[PDB]
Ligand binder design. Structure first.
Ligand SMILES: Nc1ncnc2c1ncn2[C@@H]1O[C@H](COP(=O)(O)OP(=O)(O)OP(O)(O)=S)[C@@H](O)[C@H]1O
Ligand SMILES: Nc1ncnc2c1ncn2[C@@H]1O[C@H](COP(=O)(O)OP(=O)(O)OP(O)(O)=S)[C@@H](O)[C@H]1O
Ligand SMILES: Nc1ncnc2c1ncn2[C@@H]1O[C@H](COP(=O)(O)OP(=O)(O)O)[C@@H](O)[C@H]1O
Ligand SMILES: Nc1ncnc2c1ncn2[C@@H]1O[C@H](COP(=O)(O)OP(=O)(O)O)[C@@H](O)[C@H]1O
Lengths: 548, 605
């Protein structure tokens, strides 16, 4: 009572009701009060993620004390918190010893409470502990406890671990609707259970950084305040919260709705916006992804295991680069592993990395280490027909059971990824001998487990226009830093085709071909003159090359 | 009422009407009042960097407060500050008691509380003062990011700098106040040029005050040059005066070796004397037919800042860059494909076309040894800085260990080597314009690659202290000799299987040098012999080599497995050996020229 400047009270202000009723989490209080009444290894410590309700539990304990529900062994005691940030090189221990003296002079069982004790731990308080005068209650997280309370601890023999995992959705919903009338008078508009459950599920779904009991309340109170500030609609609602979540993340409030039909029905041209032609292919792949996400197939299998073959450079990779954007929300999600190194017997274990203590161990495997983190990729396999006939064992093990075991000992799961097996077979075969070749080259019962084996059709010599038009409308962005406009002339743009297609490399060069030509040919004018940001820069076909 | 002395006021200054120009940031003000009208985690803190305009944000907040645009809980709120120009712990009770007795109507604004955080924390846990904060992001993360004891009452509010179309209005709202001291005119041309030019180029400070300091320094520079003789009329005159005194002290030199230094200092004087006259004559033209700020002094102050060149078209730099592919062919021979590529990416930066958030160029060339994959980078650094010593060259052969990543980043605070700073970061933090050479990238530990993966497409990286140096105006070069025997597929596969494809992704064109041939070797023999003459011109012993001699040389050392170094070895072993045999045996004393000629096998001097 003499040095009460680096610590607060919990039972005094509980005579005022300055604390929230603590509905939920009625088991942890029994656990704590049971550990607090032993003879040794008493004075527990709460262990859990930040923002889950550890302080909430200790406050509820204080409130049950002031009410009177505990055994008389614990009856008639106060609780005091400790702020570690109020002290901090040195003199931290001076104030700490001044505090411990007061605690000992308390001459009773006046229980303390220390939040984030792993800032203290040490050998200064253990004699205070192993004598029977203080009782501390703590708080930290699991990995912290494993660091500051496990390596140099030697005090783990007097701290009891109590776990506070995290609430469920249907439980934090009750928590919220219990903590509702408060804000209904603080701001005061109106509250709908629809808004509450919407906040809960949307935070759970898209806010993957924080945790539930406060993560939800954050959005609820911020949205209520935004609605109050609006009055410079007299109700709150689910859209009234999706707008907040969108202003929080960046993704628009439209897509923040149904994610099954509103996705399967988008498998239309929204793919064909980035991919071109091959409409049979896109429709087939869309069937594959739709009927697989229905919810009747075996739950332990990839979400798609189709392959496609034919000519090069027509967009074989581009279909996957676009598909990763629509489903997993990124084009930096695919992983491509060439089956050209894997032409020997031994190198098949390079994509796992076998033993602890050999050359490639901490480097992990090529196929697994890129999956156990971010398990939502889109795996490609260039020129699979060249891989040694031993990789197929690992591959069949994948697509027959959604699991695999790396070198470390971890278990990885492939039950929500998409396999893709490209190939350059089909040199002359149109549709007749190409399938005979791919039925005789690969194992016959392997292809029994695949999905559709669709064959890309060549670029229609007219349907080079759409791809080059996408390329050109893209490069229309290039010189927007100067706002210079571009000229198009269908003879010139078609003159790129017959001299840049090169159907041995698909359509690969048509990016450098045009960017180097236009950019570094204008690089004289763009420095001297001849152009400004209203000039379409008329470029045309000289009888030989592409002058202006 | 006892804080009227220890703190200023903004409830009365706003009624009187004096406040700095606040335009924009109205959504920010709305965010601040919105977070103030909450139950928990209210009372925000502003996060940014010095000179973004959060001071202006709170000032406009105060003006809007006195005007009235508020909710019910904001009955003018009499927002005040707590003067950090008021500084002991016995007085702070007297300061805090006034706010404590109040009902939350005198809320404070702790400008730069980053150092304030015992006394304010318990008085915050009861919830009586707002204590509006404003600091920077790194100091925030250091001080009040790890302490969750107080992070339950602080909601950071991010702010950005650029408001270009209103930065010009701010310049206007300040243009009046900068024309008073400097007897100059600050034109809208200058406003709109500085608002538009120093933004991407001088990327060390931030627009809302760097666009201010540019105009301030331009004003001071012009006011200086309004004095009779201006810049470049005060320069060659100070040069020619000094040059003369260097000549009148060399005539009285009884030496023959200093005559050739007297025979040149005279000439450069005779060359500089004219250009003094030509400018002086043209001066009177403008004297009877600069007195105002424009767009040229802007680029002037840009160039004099951070060494970065950023002008309209700098009238001495025009024919150099169109001659680059040819000007570079004086030092590097062959690899037309490589010189075209390395060249087409310097103009696209001096033109303003290239991507503004990526290095001004970053790509790799590799191939057999003794081809020039290092002389090319050296030649590049020689004609941009005019001295080859001005290239940052780090070797990746010493970084073969994992724990050597902290060698070029620095060691964390509290360890032994801490004040020494980094090795790569500490060179690009101060004066970033150089070219950085990565010798033998293959020999490095395949973990430093994860740092260049950051530098690519982001343009910066962090060090042991936590700050971020910028990498947006340099060129990054990679050298290696993977494969070294394969045509094009072995080396392609080797680099593809040695580096991540998402590291080769952000790279520009990947270059493969060919190797030298007989037709390109005579041009190298000439360079070698010219450099050798320039070297042994310190004893005035010029040489005289015959065409059969140069052909014998260029034929002798050619073998297409080691490149060109055998040529230097043969030059030494065949000429310098004999010459140094004679030079200390008398008979070839200073001031001499010895001819060489082909003999049947050797070439006698
Ligand atoms: N059962 C509950 N009853 C009432 N409020 C609860 C309950 N569980 C969580 N909360 C609230 O959730 C929020 C989380 O606050 P804290 O309990 O302090 O978080 P924490 O889990 O203790 O970790 P810290 O201390 O925030 S780092 C507070 O507003 C609590 O009041
Ligand atoms: N095309 C060239 N232009 C200029 N100097 C050249 C050329 N080819 C060779 N040389 C000279 O020959 C030597 C080769 O220098 P480097 O460029 O370091 O060799 P390299 O090609 O880098 O091979 P490595 O892999 O670095 S050992 C230097 O003395 C160069 O000056
Ligand atoms: N249908 C298409 N839609 C869009 N771009 C396409 C299409 N077909 C080919 N392309 C383009 O052709 C080029 C080759 O892409 P890709 O098939 O990934 O090449 P590679 O086979 O060399 O890996 C890319 O620029 C790609 O955008
Ligand atoms: N939007 C604005 N336009 C023009 N001048 C401004 C604006 N906001 C503030 N100013 C003035 O310019 C100064 C720029 O520095 P300031 O914004 O105070 O930086 P800080 O408070 O972060 O140190 C302000 O102090 C103010 O006097």
């Amino acid at each position: 009572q003499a040095l009460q400047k680096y610590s607060t009270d919990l039972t005094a202000r509980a005579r005022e009701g300055k604390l929230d009723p603590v509905i939920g989490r009625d088991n942890e209080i029994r656990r704590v009060v049971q550990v607090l009444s032993r003879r040794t290894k008493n004075n527990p410590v709460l262990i859990g993620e930040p923002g889950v309700g550890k302080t909430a539990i200790v406050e509820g304990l204080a409130q049950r004390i002031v009410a009177g529900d505990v055994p008389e062994s614990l009856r008639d005691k106060t609780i005091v918190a400790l702020d570690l940030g109020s002290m901090v090189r040195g003199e931290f221990e001076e104030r700490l010893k001044a505090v411990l003296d007061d605690i000992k002079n308390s001459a009773g069982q006046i229980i303390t409470f220390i939040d984030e004790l792993h800032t203290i731990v040490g050998n200064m308080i253990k004699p205070m502990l192993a004598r029977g005068e203080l009782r501390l209650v703590g708080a930290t997280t699991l990995d912290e406890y494993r660091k500051h309370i496990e390596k140099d601890a030697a005090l783990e023999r007097r701290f009891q671990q109590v776990y506070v995992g995290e609430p469920s959705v249907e439980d934090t919903i009750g928590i919220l609707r219990g903590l509702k009338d408060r804000y209904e008078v603080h701001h005061g508009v109106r509250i709908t259970d629809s808004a509450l459950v919407a906040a809960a599920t949307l935070s759970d779904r898209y806010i993957t950084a924080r945790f539930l009991p406060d993560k939800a309340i954050d959005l609820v109170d911020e949205a209520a305040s935004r609605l109050r500030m609006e009055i410079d609609k007299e109700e709150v609602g689910p859209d009234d919260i999706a707008d907040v979540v969108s202003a929080w993340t960046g993704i628009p409030a439209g897509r923040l709705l149904e994610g099954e039909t509103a996705k399967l029905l988008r498998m239309e041209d929204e793919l064909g916006k980035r991919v071109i032609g091959q409409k049979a292919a896109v429709t087939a792949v869309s069937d594959a992804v739709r009927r697989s996400r229905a919810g009747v197939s075996d739950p332990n299998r990839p979400t798609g295991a189709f392959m496609f073959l034919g000519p090069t450079g027509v967009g074989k990779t581009e279909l996957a680069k676009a598909l990763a954007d629509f489903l997993f929300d990124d084009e930096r999600a695919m992983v491509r592993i060439d089956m050209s190194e894997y032409g020997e017997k031994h190198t098949v274990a390079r994509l796992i990395g076998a033993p602890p203590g050999y050359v490639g161990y901490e480097a992990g495997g090529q196929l697994t280490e890129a999956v156990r983190r971010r398990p939502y990729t889109v795996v490609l396999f260039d020129e699979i027909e060249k891989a040694h006939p031993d990789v197929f064992d690992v591959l069949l093990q994948v697509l027959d059971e959604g699991r695999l075991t790396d070198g470390h000992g971890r278990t990885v799961d492939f039950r929500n990824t998409i396999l893709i097996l490209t190939s350059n077979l089909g040199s002359g075969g149109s549709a007749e001998q190409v399938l005979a070749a791919v039925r005789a080259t690969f194992k016959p019962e392997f292809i029994n487990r695949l999905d559709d084996v669709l064959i890309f059709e060549g670029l229609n010599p007219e349907e080079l226009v759409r791809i080059v038009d996408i390329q050109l409308a893209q490069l229309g962005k290039r010189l927007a830093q100067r706002r210079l406009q571009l000229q198009v002339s269908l003879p010139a743009k078609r003159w790129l085709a017959q001299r840049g297609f090169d159907p041995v490399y698909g359509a690969r060069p048509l990016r450098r071909l045009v960017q180097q030509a236009i950019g570094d040919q204008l690089a004289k004018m763009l420095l001297a003159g001849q152009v400004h940001d209203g000039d379409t820069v008329p470029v045309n076909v000289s009888p030989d090359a592409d002058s202006l």
